[PDB]
């Protein structure tokens, strides 16, 4: 069989965080939208980004699967995405056998 | 955020189309599509007749509409009916996420002939002065529609302090009356040559004056 | 959707008060809330707004430091804490719901943190309101002063005269003329609350100019709270 890969990405918009007393450019507070019900609703969520014009993070998780052909892997990854509440624009690169699904790219 | 500017009074006959403006700045009225309008009748809470500048909540007839140009928003009512009479306030979101109300407009649906106010200004009584107090009393009567603007002056200068004014209410003959008071110390009262009560109604101003040496 | 305010009354300037609003008939924890106040005979004034989860609050500059908004979502209750009150905070205080809902994009309804509503920027539910009166006065009877007719009160053959009813608490007072024998021309005005925390009003009557030398005019003032009854004669003053 062949190894296929999936990158599931969500986009986050960052601004200055608030740490103890006040704002900081050191640390970034980053909000994004997580699907709470497939096809119906999402809700706001956040994360912190610390690194020792807009500011955007893309949080990606990747996984692989063995399959005979791209069509089989597409079915598998589609179902995996739905099950895990991942929805967005899909692409496929045949050269690298890699699918991507990205959520909220309109931000970038 | 300073209160949004509205005319104090607008009126029309039944069937008329009237418009009420609301003027903000670029950080509230001009900065967002978030202007809303509220109708309030005596002894009741306000109710929204328009929101997001042009939109009608369910239950509000299409006689109500709204629009915005620059920093000014307008509420329009067509086919004016008696039940539309009341107070209307605009409101706007601001850039700081606060909200701000306009100063309010009394809408009168004309039920009788317009009438200019008769103004009487009473000086402090000698009895009151002997109690070490002084109150000027400006009584305003027999006018219509039911909104006036009162301004006090000492000599030529305006006086904002010590002033209280009642909202106009119906007399027995169905026209309106209102009163305004200026509270002073006897010493303050004697410190000017004259005091004036200026009453504006339907754009026309009436002025009455008293002097302490009379 | 219903909002019921309570906690109102008369309070001392400089003291504190806590207003409550019990919400019912809607999901309280997903919606923002306001306080709005209106002084008698005056316009609406926005006081404060608080997000569905209580994580953010905004107050008008005129009330900042004195009035502060909070909420308890487990009780479906909104609060306004009032400190160091001024006579100028006298008003009816309304509990008000901010209309809100999801934001629609790309086939999805988007909600704020914890599935809260985004604000639609208008108020769709009001309570009836609770009244707060700030005054240092205890029960106090009115002083009565004549507003004397003169040629300056006179015109068109008629003359205006009245009496000024000053510095009383609480409301109301009642005013008649010549023990009720005089009615036509009579208007008694609503009361104003002065910065001193005491009420005053006026009563006026218009009478024939020619009768001033003969007819006697007397305003009878009654204030029940203090058991006060005053009969004040109003006489023409001469120049
Ligand atoms: C995750 O999901 C959320 C939810 O959708 C999403 O949040 C949006 O993010 C974008 C991008 O930053 C925001 O878009 C900006 O919005 C600016 C205007 O916002 C004000 O006006 C909005 C519209 O008002 C009218 O329409 C509504 C709806 O019918 C109505 O309620 C209003 O009354 C009015 O009629 C309004 O929705 C919005 O309200 C939010 O903020 C207020 C406070 O002001 C708050 O009270 C609300 O609860 C709500 O949070 C707000 O009032 C706009 O100016 C801005 O434009 C910039 O970009 C363009 C480029 O295209 C330039 O042209 C321009 O110069 C500016 O640079 C921009 O479009 C959007 O407001 C958010 N939506 C909401 C509801 O908050 C997140 O982005 C998602 N996050 C990620 C990482 O994906
Ligand atoms: C990055 O960006 C994010 C998003 O904006 C920030 O996350 C938010 O930060 C603020 C400030 O710290 C939070 O607001 C505060 O909330 C606390 C209560 O928080 C929690 O713990 C409480 C005690 O156990 C609990 O009651 C709360 O429960 C609520 O929320 C649940 C949902 O989980 C809801 O169901 C309940 O109904 C409650 O609403 C909650 O779990 C609160 O105590 C703080 O009050 C302070 O300020 C108010 C005025 O604002 C004042 O009146 C109080 O006296 C007190 O001073 C304040 O409201 C907010 O909760 C965070 N939002 C999320 C989604 O987490 C984050 O802080 C930013 N980080 C950085 C580094 O910048």
How far apart are alpha carbons C65 and C84 in whole angstroms? Answer: 9
Domain boundary among B61, B84, B111: B111
Assigned CATH topology for domain C137-233:
Immunoglobulin-like (2.60.40)
Q: Residues B182, B112: contact at Cβ < 8 Å?
A: no
Same domain for B13 and B107, yes or no, is yes
Determination technique used: X-ray
User: Other CB atoms closer than 10 Å to residue A95's CB: what's the count?
Assistant: 5
- Number of independent structural domains in chain A: 1
* Domain, as residue range, for A84: 1-108
How far apart are alpha carbons B142 and B119 in whole angstroms? Answer: 9
Q: H or E segment at B208? A: strand B204-210
Q: Residues B182, B120: contact at Cβ < 8 Å?
A: no
Q: Do C108 and A43 make contact, defined as CB atoms within 8 angstroms?
A: no
Chosen for mutation from A43, A89, A104 (greatest number of chain C CBs closer than 10 Å) is A43
Residues of chain C with CATH 2.60.40.10: 2-136, 137-233
CA distance A82 to chain C (A): 15
Say whether B69 sits in a helix, a strand or coil.
strand
Q: H or E segment at A73? A: helix A70-83
- What are B196's strand-pairing partners? B153, B209
- What are C59's strand-pairing partners? C48
Phi and psi torsions of C178, nearest 5°: 45, 45
- Number of independent structural domains in chain B: 2
Same domain for B106 and B154, yes or no, is no
Say whether A44 sits in a helix, a strand or coil.
strand
Stated in angstroms to one decimal place, the resolution of this structure is 2.2
C-alpha dihedral sign at B61, B87, B90, B44: negative
Domain boundary among B92, B111, B130: B111
How far apart are alpha carbons C229 and C218 in whole angstroms? Answer: 13
Q: Does B194 touch chain C (CB under 8 A)?
A: no
How far apart are alpha carbons C239 and C235 in whole angstroms? Answer: 13
Closest to A58 measured CA to CA, from A22, A94, A88, A17: A88
Q: H or E segment at B150? A: strand B149-154
Closest to C10 measured CA to CA, from C222, C198, C201: C198
Q: Do C110 and A40 make contact, defined as CB atoms within 8 angstroms?
A: no
Closest CB from A41, A44, A46 relative to C109: A41
Q: Which two tokens stand for residue C215?
A: 């007819």
CA of C217 to the centre of ligand 1 (A): 68
CA of C230 to the centre of ligand 2 (A): 60
Q: Any idea which residue has 């001009």 for tokens?
A: B30
Assigned CATH for C2-136: 2.60.40.10
How far apart are alpha carbons B22 and B50 in whole angstroms? Answer: 13
* Domain, as residue range, for B88: 1-111
User: Other CB atoms closer than 10 Å to residue B19's CB: what's the count?
Assistant: 15
CATH number at residue B20: 2.60.40.10
How long is chain A? 108
Q: Residues A101, A87: contact at Cβ < 8 Å?
A: yes
CA of C30 to the centre of ligand 2 (A): 15
Same domain for B59 and B116, yes or no, is no
- What are C201's strand-pairing partners? C165
CA distance C81 to chain A (A): 25
CATH number at residue A87: 3.10.20.10
Domain boundary among B111, B135, B168: B111
Q: Which two tokens stand for residue B87?
A: 């107070």
Same domain for B50 and B138, yes or no, is no
Say whether B83 sits in a helix, a strand or coil.
helix
């Amino acid at each position: 069989m062949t190894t296929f890969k999936l990158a599931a990405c969500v986009t986050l918009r960052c601004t200055n965080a608030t740490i103890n007393g006040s704002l900081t450019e050191e640390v970034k507070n980053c909000s994004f939208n997580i699907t709470t019900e497939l096809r119906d609703k999402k809700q706001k969520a956040y994360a912190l980004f610390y690194r020792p014009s807009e500011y955007i993070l893309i949080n990606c998780q990747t996984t692989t699967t063995e399959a005979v052909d791209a069509a089989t892997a597409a079915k598998v990854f589609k179902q995996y995405a739905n099950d895990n509440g991942i929805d967005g624009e899909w692409t496929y690169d045949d050269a690298t056998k890699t699918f991507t699904v990205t959520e909220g790219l309109e931000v970038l | 955020q300073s209160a949004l500017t509205q005319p104090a009074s607008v009126s029309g006959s039944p069937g008329q189309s009237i418009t009420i403006s609301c003027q903000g700045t670029s950080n509230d009225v001009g900065g967002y599509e978030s202007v809303s309008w509220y109708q309030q009748h005596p002894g009741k809470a306000p109710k929204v007749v328009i929101y997001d500048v042009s939109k009608r909540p369910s239950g509000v007839s299409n006689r109500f509409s709204g629009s915005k140009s620059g920093n000014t928003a307008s509420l329009t009512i067509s086919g004016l009916q008696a039940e539309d009479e009341g107070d209307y306030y605009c409101k706007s979101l601001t850039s700081t996420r606060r909200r701000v109300f306009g100063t309010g407009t009394k809408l009168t649906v004309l039920g009788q002939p317009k009438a200019a106010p008769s103004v009487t200004l009473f000086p402090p009584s000698s009895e009151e002065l002997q109690a070490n107090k002084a109150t000027l009393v400006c009584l305003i009567s027999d006018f219509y529609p039911g909104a006036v603007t009162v301004a006090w002056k000492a000599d030529s200068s305006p006086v904002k302090a010590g002033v209280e004014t009642t909202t106009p209410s119906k007399q027995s003959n169905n026209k309106y009356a209102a009163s305004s008071y200026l509270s002073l110390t006897p010493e303050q009262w004697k410190s000017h040559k004259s005091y004036s009560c200026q009453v504006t109604h339907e754009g026309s101003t009436v002025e009455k004056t008293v002097a302490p040496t009379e | 959707q219903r909002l019921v305010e309570s906690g109102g009354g008369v309070v001392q300037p400089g003291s504190s008060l806590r207003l409550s609003c019990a919400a019912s008939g809607f999901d309280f924890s997903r919606q923002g809330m306001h306080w709005v106040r209106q002084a008698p005979g005056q316009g609406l004034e926005w006081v404060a707004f608080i997000k569905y989860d209580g994580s953010e609050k905004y107050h008008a500059d005129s009330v900042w430091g004195r009035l502060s908004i909070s909420r308890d979502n487990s009780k479906d209750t909104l609060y306004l804490q009032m400190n160091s009150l001024r006579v100028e905070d006298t008003a009816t205080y309304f509990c008000v719901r901010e209309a809100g809902g999801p934001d629609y994009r790309n086939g999805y309804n988007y909600y704020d943190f914890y599935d809260g509503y985004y604000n639609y920027h208008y108020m769709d539910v009001w309570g009836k309101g609770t009244t707060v009166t700030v005054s240092s006065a205890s029960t106090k009877g009115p002083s009565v002063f004549p507003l004397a007719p003169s040629s300056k009160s006179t015109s068109g053959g008629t003359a205006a005269l009245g009496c000024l009813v000053k510095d009383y608490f609480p409301e109301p007072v009642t005013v008649s003329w010549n023990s009720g024998a005089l009615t036509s021309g009579v208007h008694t005005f609503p009361a104003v609350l002065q910065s001193s925390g005491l009420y005053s009003l006026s009563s006026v009557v218009t009478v024939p100019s020619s009768s001033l030398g003969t007819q006697t005019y007397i305003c009878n003032v009654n204030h029940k709270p203090s058991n006060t009854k005053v009969d004040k004669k109003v006489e023409p003053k001469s120049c």
